[PDB]
Design a protein around this ligand. Sequence first.
Ligand SMILES: CC(=O)N[C@@H]1[C@@H](O)[C@H](O[C@@H]2O[C@H](CO[C@]3(C(=O)O)C[C@H](O)[C@@H](NC(C)=O)[C@H]([C@H](O)[C@H](O)CO)O3)[C@H](O)[C@H](O)[C@H]2O)[C@@H](CO)O[C@H]1O
Ligand SMILES: CC(=O)N[C@@H]1[C@@H](O)[C@H](O[C@@H]2O[C@H](CO[C@]3(C(=O)O)C[C@H](O)[C@@H](NC(C)=O)[C@H]([C@H](O)[C@H](O)CO)O3)[C@H](O)[C@H](O)[C@H]2O)[C@@H](CO)O[C@H]1O
Ligand SMILES: CC(=O)N[C@@H]1[C@@H](O)[C@H](O[C@@H]2O[C@H](CO[C@]3(C(=O)O)C[C@H](O)[C@@H](NC(C)=O)[C@H]([C@H](O)[C@H](O)CO)O3)[C@H](O)[C@H](O)[C@H]2O)[C@@H](CO)O[C@H]1O
Ligand SMILES: *[C@@H]1O[C@H](CO)[C@@H](O[C@@H]2O[C@H](CO)[C@@H](O)[C@H](O)[C@H]2NC(C)=O)[C@H](O)[C@H]1NC(C)=O
Ligand SMILES: *[C@@H]1O[C@H](CO)[C@@H](O[C@@H]2O[C@H](CO)[C@@H](O)[C@H](O)[C@H]2NC(C)=O)[C@H](O)[C@H]1NC(C)=O
Ligand SMILES: *[C@@H]1O[C@H](CO)[C@@H](O[C@@H]2O[C@H](CO)[C@@H](O)[C@H](O)[C@H]2NC(C)=O)[C@H](O)[C@H]1NC(C)=O
Ligand SMILES: *[C@@H]1O[C@H](CO)[C@@H](O)[C@H](O)[C@H]1NC(C)=O
Ligand SMILES: *[C@@H]1O[C@H](CO)[C@@H](O)[C@H](O)[C@H]1NC(C)=O
Ligand SMILES: *[C@@H]1O[C@H](CO)[C@@H](O)[C@H](O)[C@H]1NC(C)=O
Ligand SMILES: *[C@@H]1O[C@H](CO)[C@@H](O)[C@H](O)[C@H]1NC(C)=O
Ligand SMILES: *[C@@H]1O[C@H](CO)[C@@H](O)[C@H](O)[C@H]1NC(C)=O
Ligand SMILES: *[C@@H]1O[C@H](CO)[C@@H](O)[C@H](O)[C@H]1NC(C)=O
Ligand SMILES: *[C@@H]1O[C@H](CO)[C@@H](O)[C@H](O)[C@H]1NC(C)=O
Ligand SMILES: *[C@@H]1O[C@H](CO)[C@@H](O)[C@H](O)[C@H]1NC(C)=O
Ligand SMILES: *[C@@H]1O[C@H](CO)[C@@H](O)[C@H](O)[C@H]1NC(C)=O
Ligand SMILES: *[C@@H]1O[C@H](CO)[C@@H](O)[C@H](O)[C@H]1NC(C)=O
Ligand SMILES: *[C@@H]1O[C@H](CO)[C@@H](O)[C@H](O)[C@H]1NC(C)=O
Ligand SMILES: *[C@@H]1O[C@H](CO)[C@@H](O)[C@H](O)[C@H]1NC(C)=O
Lengths: 170, 170, 170, 316, 316, 316
Amino acid sequence: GLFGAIAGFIENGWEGLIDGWYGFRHQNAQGEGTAADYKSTQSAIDQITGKLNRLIEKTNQQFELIDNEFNEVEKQIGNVINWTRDSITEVWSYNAELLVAMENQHTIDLADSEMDKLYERVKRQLRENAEEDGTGCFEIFHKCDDDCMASIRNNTYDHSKYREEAMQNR
Amino acid sequence: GLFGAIAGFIENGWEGLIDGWYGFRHQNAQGEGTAADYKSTQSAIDQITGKLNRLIEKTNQQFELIDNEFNEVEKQIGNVINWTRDSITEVWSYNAELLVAMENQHTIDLADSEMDKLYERVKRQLRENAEEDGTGCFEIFHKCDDDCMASIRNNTYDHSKYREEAMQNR
Amino acid sequence: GLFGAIAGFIENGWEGLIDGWYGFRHQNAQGEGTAADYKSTQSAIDQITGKLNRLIEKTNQQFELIDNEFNEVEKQIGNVINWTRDSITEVWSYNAELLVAMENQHTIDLADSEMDKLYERVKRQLRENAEEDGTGCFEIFHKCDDDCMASIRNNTYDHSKYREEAMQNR
Amino acid sequence: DKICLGHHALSNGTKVNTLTERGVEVVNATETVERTNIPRICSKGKRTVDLGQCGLLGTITGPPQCDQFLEFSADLIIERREGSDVCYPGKFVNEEALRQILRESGGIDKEAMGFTYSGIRTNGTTSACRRSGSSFYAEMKWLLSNTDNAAFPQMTKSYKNTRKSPALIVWGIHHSVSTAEQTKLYGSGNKLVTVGSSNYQQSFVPSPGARPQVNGLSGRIDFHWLMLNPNDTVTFSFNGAFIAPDRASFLRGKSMGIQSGVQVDANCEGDCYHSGGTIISNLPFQNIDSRAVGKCPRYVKQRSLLLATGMKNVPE
Amino acid sequence: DKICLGHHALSNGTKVNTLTERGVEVVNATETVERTNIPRICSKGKRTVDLGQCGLLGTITGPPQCDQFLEFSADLIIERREGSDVCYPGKFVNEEALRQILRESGGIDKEAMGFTYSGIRTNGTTSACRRSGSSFYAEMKWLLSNTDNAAFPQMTKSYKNTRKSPALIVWGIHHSVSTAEQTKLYGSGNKLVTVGSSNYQQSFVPSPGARPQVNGLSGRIDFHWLMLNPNDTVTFSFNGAFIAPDRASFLRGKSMGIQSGVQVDANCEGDCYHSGGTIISNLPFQNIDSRAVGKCPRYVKQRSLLLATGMKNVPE
Amino acid sequence: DKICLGHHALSNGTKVNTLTERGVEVVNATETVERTNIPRICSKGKRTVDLGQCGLLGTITGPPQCDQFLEFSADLIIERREGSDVCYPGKFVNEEALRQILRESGGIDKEAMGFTYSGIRTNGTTSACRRSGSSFYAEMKWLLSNTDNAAFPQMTKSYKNTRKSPALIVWGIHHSVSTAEQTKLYGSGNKLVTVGSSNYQQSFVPSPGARPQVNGLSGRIDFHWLMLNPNDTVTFSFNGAFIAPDRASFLRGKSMGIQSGVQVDANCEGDCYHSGGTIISNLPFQNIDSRAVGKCPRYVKQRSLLLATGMKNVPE
Ligand SMILES: CC(=O)N[C@@H]1[C@@H](O)[C@H](O[C@@H]2O[C@H](CO[C@]3(C(=O)O)C[C@H](O)[C@@H](NC(C)=O)[C@H]([C@H](O)[C@H](O)CO)O3)[C@H](O)[C@H](O)[C@H]2O)[C@@H](CO)O[C@H]1O
Ligand SMILES: CC(=O)N[C@@H]1[C@@H](O)[C@H](O[C@@H]2O[C@H](CO[C@]3(C(=O)O)C[C@H](O)[C@@H](NC(C)=O)[C@H]([C@H](O)[C@H](O)CO)O3)[C@H](O)[C@H](O)[C@H]2O)[C@@H](CO)O[C@H]1O
Ligand SMILES: CC(=O)N[C@@H]1[C@@H](O)[C@H](O[C@@H]2O[C@H](CO[C@]3(C(=O)O)C[C@H](O)[C@@H](NC(C)=O)[C@H]([C@H](O)[C@H](O)CO)O3)[C@H](O)[C@H](O)[C@H]2O)[C@@H](CO)O[C@H]1O
Ligand SMILES: *[C@@H]1O[C@H](CO)[C@@H](O[C@@H]2O[C@H](CO)[C@@H](O)[C@H](O)[C@H]2NC(C)=O)[C@H](O)[C@H]1NC(C)=O
Ligand SMILES: *[C@@H]1O[C@H](CO)[C@@H](O[C@@H]2O[C@H](CO)[C@@H](O)[C@H](O)[C@H]2NC(C)=O)[C@H](O)[C@H]1NC(C)=O
Ligand SMILES: *[C@@H]1O[C@H](CO)[C@@H](O[C@@H]2O[C@H](CO)[C@@H](O)[C@H](O)[C@H]2NC(C)=O)[C@H](O)[C@H]1NC(C)=O
Ligand SMILES: *[C@@H]1O[C@H](CO)[C@@H](O)[C@H](O)[C@H]1NC(C)=O
Ligand SMILES: *[C@@H]1O[C@H](CO)[C@@H](O)[C@H](O)[C@H]1NC(C)=O
Ligand SMILES: *[C@@H]1O[C@H](CO)[C@@H](O)[C@H](O)[C@H]1NC(C)=O
Ligand SMILES: *[C@@H]1O[C@H](CO)[C@@H](O)[C@H](O)[C@H]1NC(C)=O
Ligand SMILES: *[C@@H]1O[C@H](CO)[C@@H](O)[C@H](O)[C@H]1NC(C)=O
Ligand SMILES: *[C@@H]1O[C@H](CO)[C@@H](O)[C@H](O)[C@H]1NC(C)=O
Ligand SMILES: *[C@@H]1O[C@H](CO)[C@@H](O)[C@H](O)[C@H]1NC(C)=O
Ligand SMILES: *[C@@H]1O[C@H](CO)[C@@H](O)[C@H](O)[C@H]1NC(C)=O
Ligand SMILES: *[C@@H]1O[C@H](CO)[C@@H](O)[C@H](O)[C@H]1NC(C)=O
Ligand SMILES: *[C@@H]1O[C@H](CO)[C@@H](O)[C@H](O)[C@H]1NC(C)=O
Ligand SMILES: *[C@@H]1O[C@H](CO)[C@@H](O)[C@H](O)[C@H]1NC(C)=O
Ligand SMILES: *[C@@H]1O[C@H](CO)[C@@H](O)[C@H](O)[C@H]1NC(C)=O
């Protein structure tokens, strides 16, 4: 994708993450744990479903028969009708192919974006109490227990409390 | 948007900012002040207006009457004409809806992008003399008077002059 | 572009870079040297060529003559045919113009993106052993010889080896 | 010591196409092109007239197989392959235009023209139109000469449309099997028939001669028609060989007409119909039938076009 | 201590649609679909011919109401509801095709055919064509028999087109009110008229009989036409009942034709016209009239489609 | 001390358009609209029939210039400006429809109708159809009266289609130069000809009279046609003035037909053809000819639409 996270600097996805689209997986004194981020998952879901509702609709435009399947119309008028119908088919076949391709490009980039937005949010929270691993992970200098990890996930992590100890451990 | 600034990590816009699209609002010893960034504002404006000039044009293609409003044409040919016109109407109605939707998606993402580009420019100027707040703001360790703030806005801010004092104040 | 690197915080391209699309140009004790990044160059090339293969195809849809160039068809039917053909021409002329414009917008943004992805990769490798210049360049505090520069380019650069000396030289 | 960011994934994704790429796998996707047909005419909630053995044009003239359709009323009209517009061999001039008018008519209401006759016969019948013995088109009258070889007097009958909507008028022209049999029925000489309305101007001389035996008979009847506007008058000058209208038809409102070989079903609802059945779908496109009518998804040539509804799948 | 980055905003934005979302508010937006009509025919700078009571096809034959349009010249031609192509009751065969030819003709120039007559009358008139007493179509001649019931000699008149552009030729066929009144005017017997050009091959036998009274008259005149190529010759063999052309028409160049019920205005300029007026706009789309002609925005069904010209609105 | 990131560039780029901008320069670009024509009909690998002086409709009737095309077989059929459908002056009714049928026929196979005649002549010829002296249409027979002014007996000939595909049937109607010359050839009186198939119902009275001299001759022959379905029977009742079919045509399969003034070439292959030649291209669009046929890029009005294949060019 354009934002270089999904199939980018993140190696791969997690098949264990059945909770949501995006999430956190930590390591600390208590061990490893994994959880989903609601806000990011929901923002991507809402945007995709909004594409669907827009495309999955049929027009109220009525068309009638202009030829006949049991009693062939005159040949000249019949050939004009067929030529016109085939010309229209060619237009819609193009429109459909182009619509889905461009939507699909945007949908993949959109998901890539949301991952990046989540990654950047977390970096901005930690404020010199952590550094970038480069594989989509943050090495934390100070000791961050399960209580501490949850605070990061819930946006309640106060960087100033752990600053001095993390700073020193540089 | 895709770049996560507008309606993202920036809480909201400023209704006081009538100078331009994007701007700076500072706080220091002398107090608070707000000003617009010309370059970013102009780059977004130019890009949007260029979309307009491209779309707001009418084709030099002439079409004539093929039916008659005072003296109805023969029914069979009339029904072929109407079917064809309605088929064309359906194509253009689709084209118009899709064009405006995709342009609108791009226009919003484009504005989001320009905000991000401005935010990142400033970060790159400060070079360890400041840290990220996370709400679209930069906490400056050294003392930055109105003269100093203007230097940032005008791209003339020399990070090396204030480095030692800001570094120490970490 | 949307990602603000090409014709953004990078001043310009290198006409000397005939090796690939993207590359590194260093300065050290041994002097200056320039080389291309395969992975980034190839990712952009593959994506663009994939657009081409998708568009450079002709449909297997056959159309026949419905009028006559040596023996004019009846006027009424002839005018319906011409009106329909001209209506179709107008649709395709629009489709072609819109396709190429939107593809071109995406192609330029796509190239901008790939440059950014490469720039960010390198930043993530250096991990506090370097700082951002702001012109698309990284000032390295520790001494990085030609052997060292190549390690960065080939993704084998170990930040922990040079950390202490670079950290101190802040 | 650390906290990692990631995204979900599957062992196997669903392949889709993009601007850049054919067959990139994504976490979830959905179909945009409808392939599912329902092999019935879904007519729930709709006034439906299945014509069966009655041909649509026969509703106006009235061969025996159309006796129960002379004044039908409908939202949906279904034509069948077994339908016949005629009993006595013949066809309509400008036939498909008339079908198109009747398909969207909402059906027909009938009213007497008011023609009365003197100096001729009006009760001509045939074995091809069977109503317990020989009969004729219910809405028409076979005008003859009083007796064999007797002259047919040059007649002028008129009818003004005194209603607010246009009147559908149909008449016929009988071409006998021979030059002799025309003189027997209508007397010798060159028979002429003319027709004049504000919009309309035409004439009809007959042409007897041998045709192939249809229904056992080698004669033919041409059927002709026009739409007579409100307050407009139509006149018929005829020397013979003329099948006179008894009633005029008026259009009730709005309908849609289809052709089909499948059964009606009042348990399902649909607005998109083809000869093989009903397309029930909210997808924007369909690959079932390019001649489908009603309110339909757009026909496309591709069988399938999958829309990504998930991120790119990047498995372990 | 700090410096913050932000963007502008309003209390209230303008709702627009995107790929993802219905009704997202943005700082500014603009309309892409034109709804504003100008209720006049904007004809500034254009040679304009408003036909009024003259029917367009009447410019070729010349009923009294078209006397001032026999050789008109135009960029824009306006047909009116009150227009009539005829004085003596009748119509044109292939009428709409001919209208389409004349709408883009740039007008017409007229030239004598050169027909001279011997053994017949050429000055037939009627009360329906009034020029201070009874008259006829200015460009035509009603060919008669010298006296009542007198024979009409089998005639052959020809005309070669010696000009560089194709010639529009029109002739007529008079159907009298009765079988008797045809013999009075042109003698008894079966009258025939034939027409042969390089491209064209047809014949015309008449058909007298009673039509409804139009302009007080129950007779009719058919009008027929063909385009005669440069250096091609056309011949008329006729036994009677024939309305002969006096002049041929040639097309001047290029024009466009419209139908309208609104006034002309030389103070406004436009290139997109419909019966209700002129669409002046640079927007790519319009929701005023799907049958608008000239150089127009594309018709769409939506009344409004707003294009964002500002960022997303995120108020305090 | 440092390491810089950059991208490639040129002194001069290639201008292209985007959503935002006209004429932005990029590193590389490529054309999407084909302008290159090949001025030959590229027919490599295709069974090709170049009609030359034979008119396509003449393959069915058989004037001398079509003698080598009476049973042709083809994938591609080429019509030429010099082609003529006739030898004796005349034309076809519903001519363009028939051309369209024959263009995609894959060619024609011929079979005897089986008509035998008694009490009349069958060997009528003319100087306009030259095969070492006077001749006639190879597939037709000019039916006459035994001697001058002799009556033509009212005839009835029939033909059933006993094959699995529909039969193309053509007949003709001779209009002589005068009223006298018609009686000479077929006897006096009003001649009638009628035609009746399951699908079809029509009649034909002739119309003699003077036409302009074509090939030195002022007579004309109308040619008429119908498609006779499998197991259907067609009957011809005629009093004279009738050009009888000797053989019926059956369609072989599939082809495409073009009109062209350029040479055939079996060294190049193409599937998109116009009168000026062949469009060989894989580009999605073309600006050569809006009436091109076969499998073609879509016609567009723009001469050029360049697609970026490189990044934006940002020179030193
Ligand atoms: C009663 C009489 O005078 N003659 C009888 C013959 O008609 C009959 O020959 C059969 O005739 C059949 C056709 O008969 C009709 C019909 O269409 O059914 C009878 C209709 O009354 C007559 N109607 C009118 C208005 O004239 C109708 C009409 O003349 C023609 O349809 C015009 O084309 O003809 C049919 O042709 C049979 O194939 C034929 O055998 C013989 C033998 O049954 O008996 C005679 O007494
Ligand atoms: C003068 C004469 O011999 N007879 C007079 C009757 O004509 C007249 O009856 C009225 O006739 C009216 C129609 O008259 C015309 C016409 O169209 O105005 C007169 C034209 O000169 C004649 N032209 C030609 C070339 O023949 C024309 C033509 O015959 C017909 O239009 C052919 O259809 O007829 C009209 O029908 C009136 O309604 C009718 O009363 C009577 C009474 O006024 O006086 C007679 O002296
Ligand atoms: C032999 C005879 O009785 N009369 C000779 C005249 O025919 C001839 O006048 C020339 O006639 C030319 C037309 O001749 C044909 C033709 O089309 O070539 C001859 C055909 O045999 C005849 N065919 C039939 C079936 O009747 C054909 C036909 O009648 C007409 O085409 C019907 O329209 O006519 C042509 O008109 C010349 O311009 C004309 O001079 C004279 C002079 O040569 O000699 C007579 O002996
Ligand atoms: C126009 O197209 C229709 C099909 O859309 C043609 O009708 C088909 O003809 C083929 C070949 O004879 C048959 O196998 C099918 O049964 C027909 N399908 C239908 C739906 O009718 C038709 O022939 C074409 N018209 C002309 C004038 O060629
Ligand atoms: C083709 O469509 C036109 C409208 O675009 C139909 O004409 C309208 O008919 C309705 C119903 O009779 C009238 O209320 C309108 O006044 C008509 N509008 C115009 C612009 O003419 C027309 O009937 C249709 N053609 C056929 C053959 O059905
Ligand atoms: C329909 O359009 C065609 C062109 O696509 C018209 O034919 C051209 O007519 C012009 C002017 O007479 C000539 O210069 C060209 O030689 C013609 N081109 C071709 C390809 O035939 C045609 O006249 C139009 N049809 C009608 C009925 O107006
Ligand atoms: C992956 O492969 C299995 C193999 O049987 C198949 O059943 C499954 O459909 C695939 N998964 C997806 C999501 O398509
Ligand atoms: C995946 O998309 C399909 C659309 O066909 C939908 O029905 C289904 O609910 C979705 N499933 C999940 C797990 O998102
Ligand atoms: C038809 O009408 C005539 C008198 O108008 C009558 O004599 C004759 O019997 C009638 N025909 C039949 C079959 O009853
Ligand atoms: C028809 O004419 C009658 C007058 O008898 C009148 O009542 C009615 O309004 C008229 N309608 C139209 C459409 O002319
Ligand atoms: C916001 O609301 C006011 C309420 O009257 C309305 O007038 C105004 O148009 C709205 N603002 C915008 C920009 O639409
Ligand atoms: C907003 O856009 C409209 C387009 O309708 C334009 O006329 C106006 O000048 C714009 N106003 C501002 C403040 O940008
Ligand atoms: C018409 O012409 C004839 C002679 O050709 C003449 O006698 C007659 O009076 C003319 N008609 C009129 C009304 O003057
Ligand atoms: C018409 O023929 C004349 C010969 O008299 C000649 O001058 C002119 O060029 C010809 N034009 C055409 C189009 O054949
Ligand atoms: C740049 O300019 C030169 C001047 O002659 C021209 O030949 C060349 O085509 C241009 N370069 C490109 C890539 O178009
Ligand atoms: C540039 O693109 C063109 C397409 O016309 C292609 O033929 C050529 O190989 C490309 N050249 C380079 C250097 O990429
Ligand atoms: C044509 O046939 C008749 C007899 O059917 C014969 O007498 C005559 O000579 C033939 N015509 C020619 C030119 O041989
Ligand atoms: C035509 O009829 C014959 C019976 O003689 C039969 O063999 C053949 O199958 C029939 N074909 C059709 C299409 O009716």
